Design a protein around this ligand. Structure first.
Ligand SMILES: [Zn+2]
Ligand SMILES: [Zn+2]
Ligand SMILES: [Zn+2]
Ligand SMILES: [Zn+2]
Ligand SMILES: [Zn+2]
Ligand SMILES: [Zn+2]
Ligand SMILES: [Zn+2]
Ligand SMILES: [Zn+2]
Ligand SMILES: [Zn+2]
Ligand SMILES: [Zn+2]
Length: 223
């Protein structure tokens, strides 16, 4: 019977630094992995208040993506051992965030460990000046490659003064044991900040994520 229950909790710890500013975050989350939604509460436990935009940290929990039965749910199937991911975010103004993560299931809940480093953000840019205010919905394009599941997305952070600040995101998600990979598909995601204290040292988020077949192009109908 099911390792991943219809309701699952998680704990997460991140160690990070952005433009030299070190910090740690601890959090706990919960959600319904087969329905595709989840929430999390994070606390900046060291290094607060952060001198940069929370939004670059917000996308740093793929067990909770709803999948139709005909798309292998590779990352759920990886449990209880779990999976790792590695991510590069290349922001439009040259800032770069790298992230590594380990996901496992221990004592009936998910355990997440994250390490993050951001560098090369302009001192007067929207990240270091805290001038973003959330992200738009996105669609992560998922595809098998090099024995892992890759995702590619273009994140759009909303600027306080209107307009967007963007990042090209590439992630590699790899099960700790060989698990059947899906074919290429798409995950529609929306992530909201649902609560924060005045200096964003306590932040709560809600995410909805659902996999579907790729829309495809007209060209493919002639194949
Ligand atoms: Zn039920
Ligand atoms: Zn500092
Ligand atoms: Zn609750
Ligand atoms: Zn310290
Ligand atoms: Zn289908
Ligand atoms: Zn735009
Ligand atoms: Zn709260
Ligand atoms: Zn706010
Ligand atoms: Zn205020
Ligand atoms: Zn084509």
């Amino acid at each position: 019977m099911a390792i991943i229950k219809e309701f699952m909790r998680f704990k997460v710890h991140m160690e990070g630094s952005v433009n030299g500013h070190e910090f740690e975050i601890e959090g706990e989350g919960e959600g319904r992995p087969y329905e595709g939604f989840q929430t999390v509460k994070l606390k900046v436990t060291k290094g607060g208040p952060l001198p940069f935009a929370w939004d670059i940290l917000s996308p740093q929990s793929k067990a909770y993506v709803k999948h139709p039965a005909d798309i292998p749910d590779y990352l759920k199937l990886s449990f209880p051992e779990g999976f790792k991911w590695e991510r590069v975010m290349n922001f439009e103004d040259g800032g770069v965030v790298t992230v590594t993560q380990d996901s496992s299931l221990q004592d009936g809940e998910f355990i997440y460990k994250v390490k993050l480093r951001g560098t090369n953000f302009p001192s007067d840019g929207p990240v270091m000046q805290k001038k973003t205010m959330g992200m738009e919905a996105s669609s992560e394009r998922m595809y098998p490659e090099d024995g892992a599941l890759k995702g590619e997305d273009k994140l759009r952070l909303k600027l306080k003064d209107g307009g967007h600040y963007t990042s090209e995101v590439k992630t590699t998600y790899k099960a700790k044991k060989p698990v059947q990979l899906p074919g290429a598909y798409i995950v529609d995601i929306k992530l909201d900040i649902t609560s924060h204290n005045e200096d964003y040292t306590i932040v709560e988020q809600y995410e909805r994520a659902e996999g579907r077949h790729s829309t495809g192009g007209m060209d493919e109908l002639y194949k």
